[PDB]
Amino acid sequence: AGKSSLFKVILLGDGGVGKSSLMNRYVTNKFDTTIGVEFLNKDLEVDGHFVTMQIWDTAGQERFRSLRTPFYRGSDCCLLTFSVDDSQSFQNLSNWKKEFIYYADVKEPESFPFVILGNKIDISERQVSTEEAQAWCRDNGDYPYFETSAKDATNVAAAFEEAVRRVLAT
Ligand SMILES: Nc1nc2c(ncn2[C@@H]2O[C@H](COP(=O)(O)OP(=O)(O)O)[C@@H](O)[C@H]2O)c(=O)[nH]1
């Protein structure tokens, strides 16, 4: 039978930025306004090869954070997510990157693929400009940056497709 490779992607970011909604939008093409760790699978294709992505949202319960970090290991790409209406969530990207590197024990962090998502761009009143987000991305690893909306689907599939491409580029 036609083989398929399995890529593990993890979503990290502050509560409320839209991680669950992004994954659900990508996999089910629905949005509608979950307590523990959840992961979903999606088939796609890259350069004519079948692949499957397994998307983890490891934001269970904060008092049990120590029990969620074992599930970082084996991640092939990390999608760091903030909301463009929430500057605090943007300011926390660096700390999310650090948590991931530490608890996933990334041995070559300078080469590990990250993708940055600025979600909720359907909201006109922003606290983070496009330019400020792009500058952070350029200056903190030159990661791909997507302005997304789970609510309207803008750039959602593109962001996840890019995650798999970045994995392949190793
Ligand atoms: N306007 C808007 N609201 C969104 C978007 N994505 C998620 N939401 C809402 O923001 C809240 C937090 O979403 P959720 O996916 O639970 O965030 P998580 O805590 O990061 O998993 C919910 O009320 C969502 O409906 C979006 O792209 N646009």
Question: Of 160, 149, 155, 157, nearest to 18 (Cα)?
Answer: 149
Question: Of 4, 1, 17, nearest to 96 (Cα)?
Answer: 17
Report the 3 state secondary structure along the chain. Answer: CCCEEEEEEEEECCCCCCHHHHHHHHHHCCCCCCCCCEEEEEEEEECCEEEEEEEEECCCCHHHHHHCHHHHCCCCEEEEEEECCCHHHHHCHHHHHHHHHHHHCCCCCCCCCEEEEEECCCCCCCCCCHHHHHHHHHHCCCCCEEECCCCCCCCHHHHHHHHHHHHHCC
Instruction: Say how far apart CA 57 and CA 40 lie, in whole Å.
Output: 9
Resolution (A): 1.2
Instruction: Say how far apart CA 116 and CA 80 lie, in whole Å.
Output: 5
Give me ligand 1 centre to Cα 146, in Å.
16
CATH number for the domain running over 1-170? 3.40.50.300
Instruction: Say how far apart CA 103 and CA 72 lie, in whole Å.
Output: 7
Strand partners, 117: 81, 146
Instruction: Say how far apart CA 124 and CA 63 lie, in whole Å.
Output: 34
* Any ligand 1 atom below 6 A from CB of 83: no
And the tokens for 157?
């599939």
Q: Which of 20, 21, 127 best tests ligand 1's pocket when mutated (most atoms within 8 Å of CB)?
A: 21
Residue identifier of the C-alpha nearest atom 13 of ligand 1? 18
Instruction: Say how far apart CA 103 and CA 109 lie, in whole Å.
Output: 12
Instruction: Say how far apart CA 72 and CA 10 lie, in whole Å.
Output: 7
Instruction: Say how far apart CA 21 and CA 143 lie, in whole Å.
Output: 22
- 81 in Cβ contact with 121 (< 8 Å): no
Phi/psi for 75 (5° steps) reads -65, 135
Q: For residue 32, which atom of ligand 1 is closest to its CA?
A: 25
* Any ligand 1 atom below 6 A from CB of 68: no
Residues 6+ apart with CB under 8 A from 130: 118, 147
Give me ligand 1 centre to Cα 10, in Å.
17
Q: Give the angle 43-116-101 at the CA atoms, nearest 5°.
A: 90
* Any ligand 1 atom below 6 A from CB of 38: no
Instruction: Say how far apart CA 74 and CA 7 lie, in whole Å.
Output: 9
- 135 in Cβ contact with 145 (< 8 Å): no
- 3 in Cβ contact with 71 (< 8 Å): no
Q: For residue 13, which atom of ligand 1 is closest to its CA?
A: 20
* Any ligand 1 atom below 6 A from CB of 122: yes
Count of residues making up the chain? 170
Residue identifier of the C-alpha nearest atom 8 of ligand 1? 18
Q: Where are the domains of the chain?
A: 1-170
* Any ligand 1 atom below 6 A from CB of 19: yes
